[PDB]
């Protein structure tokens, strides 16, 4: 109030020491930051072959959470469960009858690449989750076509680390159940339905279509205006 004044600054070319703005757009990031950022960009340019274009087709939040709620219902044994189950089995079945048959036939989600792959070949699988982000991607490229060949429902689900939690690890690449309890047999055919309409039955069309392109921002407008103004 009339003792304090209004002294505006001229923040334009030629005067007033420019004020601190936000230069996050410009910072010279560590070399490791540009390489992971530009390996994305490079791979976005260049026509990517359809059998790599297969991925990027992840899974909607709702049908994913649906498949996970079901997959969560089949956690493999904990460290402590199998701990007692063996002092339950061995300290009894090796003291009586039943060849270690002092425990119920388990229902597990089935994990591990080599494991799963043979399950898809022996036609024991009923639904299979494949991470969109396995590198090296050759670890999994062929799995859509393995499934489609064998008549096995697959879905390319977002998260190689989301599958890790479902088997209590860090990452798990793939996850695929085979048995399933009889009460759950409902949602299985329900999910597979919504799934096989998004993947396995689209497979033939996707295989025909490449990915890539995208000029990157600044060049795209330069082509846009080249046909917006100059047309």
């Amino acid at each position: 109030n009339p003792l304090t004044h209004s002294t505006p600054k001229n923040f334009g070319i030629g005067q007033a020491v420019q004020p601190k703005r936000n230069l996050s757009r410009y910072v010279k990031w560590p070399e490791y930051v540009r390489v992971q950022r530009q390996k994305k960009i490079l791979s976005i340019r260049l026509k990517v072959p359809p059998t790599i274009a297969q991925f990027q087709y992840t899974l909607d939040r709702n049908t994913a959470a649906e498949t996970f709620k079901l997959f969560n219902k089949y956690r493999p044994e904990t460290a402590a469960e199998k701990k007692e189950r063996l002092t339950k089995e061995a300290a009894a079945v090796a003291e009586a009858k039943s060849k270690q048959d002092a425990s119920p036939k388990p229902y597990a989600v089935k994990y591990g690449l080599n494991h799963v792959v043979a399950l898809i070949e022996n036609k024991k699988a009923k639904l299979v989750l494949i991470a969109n982000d396995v590198d090296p991607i050759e670890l999994v490229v062929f799995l859509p076509a393995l499934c489609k060949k064998m008549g096995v429902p697959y879905a390319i689900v977002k998260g190689k680390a989301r599958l890790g939690t479902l088997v209590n690890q860090k990452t798990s690449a793939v996850a695929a159940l085979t048995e399933v309890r009889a009460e759950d047999e409902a949602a299985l055919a329900k999910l597979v339905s919504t799934i096989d309409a998004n993947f396995a039955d689209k497979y033939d069309e996707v295989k025909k279509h490449w990915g890539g392109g995208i000029l990157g921002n600044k060049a795209q407008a330069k082509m846009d205006k080249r046909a917006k103004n100059s047309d």
Binding site: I13, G14, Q18
Partner: protein
Amino acid sequence: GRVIRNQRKGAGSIFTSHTRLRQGAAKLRTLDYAERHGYIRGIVKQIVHDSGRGAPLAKVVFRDPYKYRLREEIFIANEGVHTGQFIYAGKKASLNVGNVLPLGSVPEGTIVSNVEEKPGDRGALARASGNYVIIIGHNPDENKTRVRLPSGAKKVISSDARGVIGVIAGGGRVDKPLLKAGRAFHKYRLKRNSWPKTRGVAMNPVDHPHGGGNHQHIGKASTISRGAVSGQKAGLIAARRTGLLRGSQKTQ
């Protein structure tokens, strides 16, 4: 034979440049947001003599657009420019001698010195005493401008290449007869170990293609193929012609 003298220049050593008393490197300001859009004032604080370079350097200091501090660039003074003179540099700068503008922002017929080869390279052309490049025309087919260069060749560079209006200072230095060996001596004493000069023909064969004797003569045509090999290149190299000509002008 022996490694001839012009081959020994390459390995630096005894032949590098004498720079102890050189001021700084002469350069335009780094092309910043200011020059790229508007202009920016600076005062020349002194115009100073740089060793090994007739044609004086102007020390002209600006303010820093991004921090409270004074930032001094080193120009090549441009004759007529004085101490205390304000220097305006940028796209929107005014056509005055001493100032520095993009080449597209100056009409045909502007004579400028210390101009850039690619934009922002901070200076390349017409820098020696009394020189200047002439703007002959423009071509808004990609921001290009056709200039005439001191040697005579006309060249096209980007209109975003900065020049500085005017001639370089340093008059007609080469008009004064050098007179004594001593003056030539001191001259190259402040540049590079290139003087005096022994005639190849005064050498022995080990030293030079001309070195053979019993009579001082080159013995073969002194005009050497461009394709000749390092060791052979002494004389008039890819000499299109030779002899006296009295030839008036250049290549317009």
